[PDB]
Write a protein that binds this ligand. Structure first.
Ligand SMILES: Nc1nc2c(c(=O)[nH]1)N[C@H]1[C@@H](S)[C@@H](S)[C@@H](COP(=O)(O)OP(=O)(O)OC[C@H]3O[C@@H](n4cnc5c(=O)[nH]c(N)nc54)[C@H](O)[C@@H]3O)O[C@H]1N2
Ligand SMILES: Nc1nc2c(c(=O)[nH]1)N[C@H]1[C@@H](S)[C@@H](S)[C@@H](COP(=O)(O)OP(=O)(O)OC[C@H]3O[C@@H](n4cnc5c(=O)[nH]c(N)nc54)[C@H](O)[C@@H]3O)O[C@H]1N2
Length: 794
């Protein structure tokens, strides 16, 4: 059937779609988008796939025995189907039992993640609002991306920096001589955004490729691996041993002292503490000068190459662009801190195309905003007019808010006391947990340790669109529909604010699935508080209310038509903006425009932190050895290979791994691909296409061989997001519940360690990992990850 195209959008971009034979016929890019992503070929598979959640289900023994069931069985995949009313009655009864027997400290419902775009249907917000109307629970602070970075920068530059707007791309293209990409791959990571992604940044990357060819701009990539960006631009690379970056920075600062290359004016007028740091680099107290000769065998860079780099950074106007990966390792606050110190010693902060950036690889930061106000959202909290059924604040002496990544450690040892960014934290006694809009069995580390911690839980509830590993390890499960099976509203470009889009319903929700609004409105009915929850409005009434409010705010500078007209058009345009320079104000007059630090200047040495007395984070940057390190680091005698689980090029974390046809374009021999170097492959007799087994003293998995020159000796890669699918010793689905079971597909976190960054931020350290690998020789199993549950009938 040939009809008019409809409008919509997602984290991958804005689209245009047409329907035929009652199904979505085809996807086309939105007109204004000139650089779409290849992942546009996987969209249709996300809605029509084999891992779809058909109806509500409850785990066998839990259905039969309630909170007194055999928890050792989680993971075997056997479930029983039930009606919506029965499933909701059970859910509520469980919340009753826990508030009564234990109280608020025994429930954890605050985990967040990459939920789909949409101002009205946002899943995590609907769950928390309804559950709150029942009773309180435990919350968290932080995230898995910039955990350490966001905790340290406020002390140095006076802000988190990572999520702020930066210097405009044009100003950079016209003034920068050298652009340093340190642990940064923007060509690959710019394909997605927080809101509908405009992809504007790709036009500027194209202009950059020109400058590189003409020989007008020099780009240097400091990375242990050859990146996608380096290949696209045709620029150079500087190898560095993984995790040894800090020794290089210290050596560079040593050259600048000896041969007077640092800007003395900027230091004296814009910072504090330089004179307290010098002694360390110079070795006047500890006994060792941090010279290039010293750093060389550690970082893997020759003394003369280090001196050459130093002269280059002061030769012209230099612009630093740091990624996020480097701070996701043990002591991750150090490289971020020491970087800011180098930028200060150079003294080009505040100039167009000079200084340092921590985010030009995220949601098109660098393209100027229109200046318009964006639309509001559905509330995730109770309204001033209401109260919950219970409402107790007794946490039995424990903390009501914990560091995001310490949640497993708390289930394992309640009542323990930990240090945390200048305060004390006490772990609560958790018995029940709720998940919506996130996938814990993908994002956390150490699968086999997580299995032991789960044995101590009484109830686990999950709402998702597909049968993910998290659902596989739950007690009650509820089905939701995709954004293409409902109506919503969203802004175009998280930082651009180019306009406002319309997310129109394409087809009817499949099977027994429901929209997140519907799911929690029914729950509110059980509690007898339906109207209060919804504010007495439906889907379209809510959307119309949010548009009108946005139009009200923008009344002064932007014109907008009425809702009826807007919906028919499917889009409303805002405009372009003017260029801007990041730290120009503080530069012009630091007396008038100080920073948010305690003194108002840049702090190379902080009195505040030094006062804490922490052993693994002191008054100034230092080099400290890690627990597991390659190329001569501790532990490389038994497990020589470094494992990096860098973000995927053809997925958004775990989202899209379910798209059948599209996935089969990169899968190898049924498994997820492992990228291996020629030298290491030869030493083990491995060839392309062979099934490989990667392991260590904590876990084991299977994967497909891919030999590549982009990987140096001693390093392998397996992308984060590959679905966890364990099997027994006989290759069965059910045996997958066993502690120590082999993963038939290849999830990297099956081999990772659960450690805290340092006493300062207590964040994720996933990249500190050592392993070993061999050619798999045993009976080959079938993948259990994508085929859904075993249905048991009573
Ligand atoms: N080893 C290693 N570990 C890492 C990382 C690493 O570099 N290495 N990187 C990490 C970071 S940066 C982050 S962002 C993280 C990602 O996991 P996550 O947030 O759960 O998103 P996700 O994985 O995409 O899963 C989101 C789930 O949400 C569901 N969903 C999405 N939208 C909807 C919706 O509208 N309603 C409902 N009911 N659910 C919805 C998805 O189906 C998915 O299962 O994993 C970190 N961990
Ligand atoms: N296509 C796609 N886009 C996305 C995402 C996605 O899932 N898919 N997710 C997004 C979110 S969640 C966030 S957190 C972000 C990821 O940033 P980042 O960790 O820096 O990318 P990274 O790729 O994990 O790492 C970048 C580089 O860091 C190098 N590296 C890693 N460790 C070190 C080290 O110690 N020393 C040095 N010098 N460099 C190191 C890596 O080689 C990689 O090139 O990317 C978003 N964009």
């Amino acid at each position: 059937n040939e009809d008019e195209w409809l409008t919509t959008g997602s984290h991958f971009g804005a689209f245009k779609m047409k329907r035929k034979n009652g199904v979505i016929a085809e996807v086309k890019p939105f007109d204004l988008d000139k650089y779409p992503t290849d992942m546009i070929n996987g969209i249709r598979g996300m809605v029509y796939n084999p891992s779809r959640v058909r109806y509500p289900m409850v785990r066998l023994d839990f259905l039969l025995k309630g909170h007194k069931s055999n928890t050792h069985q989680r993971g075997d995949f056997r479930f029983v189907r039930v009606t919506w009313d029965k499933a909701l009655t059970l859910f509520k009864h469980s919340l009753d039992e826990v508030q009564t027997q234990y109280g608020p400290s025994g429930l954890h419902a605050g985990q967040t993640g990459w939920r789909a775009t949409g101002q009205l249907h946002s899943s995590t917000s609907h769950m928390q609002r309804a559950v709150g109307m029942h009773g309180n629970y435990v919350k968290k602070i932080g995230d898995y991306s910039t955990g350490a970075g966001q905790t340290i920068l406020p002390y140095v530059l006076g802000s988190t920096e990572v999520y702020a707007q930066g210097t405009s791309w044009p100003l950079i293209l016209e003034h920068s001589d050298t652009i340093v990409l340190w642990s940064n791959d923007p060509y690959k990571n710019l394909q997605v955004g927080w809101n509908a992604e405009t992809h504007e940044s790709f036009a500027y990357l194209a202009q950059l490729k020109e400058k590189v060819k003409q020989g007008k701009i020099r780009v240097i990539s400091i990375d242990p691996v050859v990146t996608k960006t380096q290949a696209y631009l045709g620029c150079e690379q500087l190898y560095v041993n993984p995790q040894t970056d800090v020794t290089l920075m210290l050596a560079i600062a040593h050259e600048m002292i000896s041969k007077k290359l640092y800007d003395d004016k900027f230091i004296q007028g814009y910072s504090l503490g330089f004179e307290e740091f010098v002694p360390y680099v110079m070795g006047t107290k500890d006994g060792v000068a941090k010279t290039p000769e010293w750093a060389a065998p550690i970082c893997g860079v020759e003394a003369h190459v280090i001196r050459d780099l130093a002269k280059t950074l002061v030769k012209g106007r230099t612009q630093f662009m740091m990624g996020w990966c480097i701070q996701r390792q043990q002591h991750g606050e150090q490289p971020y801190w020491m970087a800011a110190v180098l930028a200060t010693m150079i003294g080009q902060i505040g100039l167009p195309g000079g200084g340092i950036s921590y985010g030009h690889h995220y949601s098109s930061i660098g393209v100027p905003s229109s200046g318009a106000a964006a639309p509001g959202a559905f509330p995730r909290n109770l309204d001033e007019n209401q109260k919950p059924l219970f409402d107790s604040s007794d946490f039995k002496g424990a903390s009501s808010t914990i560091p995001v990544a310490r949640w497993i450690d708390a289930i394992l040892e309640p009542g323990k006391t930990i240090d945390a960014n200048g305060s004390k934290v006490v772990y609560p006694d958790i018995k029940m947990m709720i998940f919506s809009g996130n996938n814990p069995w993908n994002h956390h580390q150490d699968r086999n340790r997580m299995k032991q911690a789960f044995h101590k839980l009484e109830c686990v509830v999950t709402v998702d669109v597909n049968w993910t590993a998290t659902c596989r390890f739950s007690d009650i499960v509820l089905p939701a529909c995709t954004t293409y099976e409902r109506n919503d509203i969203d802004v175009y470009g998280a930082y651009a604010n180019r306009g406002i889009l319309a997310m129109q319903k394409m087809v009817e929700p499949l099977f027994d699935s429901l929209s997140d609004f519907e799911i929690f409105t029914r729950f509110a009915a059980v509690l007898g508080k339906e109207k209060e929850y919804t504010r007495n409005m439906g889907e379209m009434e809510w959307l119309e209310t949010l548009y009108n409010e946005c139009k009200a705010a923008n009344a002064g500078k932007f014109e907008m038509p009425d809702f009826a007209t807007f919906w028919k058009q499917g889009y409303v345009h805002f405009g372009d903006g003017e260029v801007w320079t990041r730290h120009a104000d503080f530069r012009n007059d630091p007396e008038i425009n100080p920073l948010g630090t305690p003194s108002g200047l840049i702090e190379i040495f902080s009195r505040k932190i030094d006062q804490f007395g922490y052993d693994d984070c002191k008054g100034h940057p230092t080099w400290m050895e890690k627990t597991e390190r390659s190329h001569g680091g501790p532990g490389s005698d038994k497990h020589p290979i470094w494992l990096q689980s860098c973000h995927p090029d053809k997925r958004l974390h775990s989202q899209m791994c379910e798209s059948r046809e599209y996935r089969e374009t990169y899968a190898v021999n049924g498994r997820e691909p492992v990228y291996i170097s020629p030298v290491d492959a030869k030493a083990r007799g491995i060839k392309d296409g062979d099934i490989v087994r990667v392991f260590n003293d904590r876990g084991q998995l299977l994967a497909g061989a891919v030999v590549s020159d982009n990987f140096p000796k001693g390093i392998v890669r397996i992308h984060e997001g590959a679905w966890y699918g364990p099997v027994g010793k006989d290759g069965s689905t059910e045996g997958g519940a066993e502690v120590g079971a082999l993963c038939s597909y290849g999830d990297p976190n099956t081999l990772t360690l659960d450690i805290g960054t340092s006493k300062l931020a207590q964040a994720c350290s996933a990249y500190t990992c050592l392993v070993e690998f061999e050619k798999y020789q045993g009976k080959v199993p079938k993948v259990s990850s994508f085929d859904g549950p075993i249905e048991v009938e009573i």
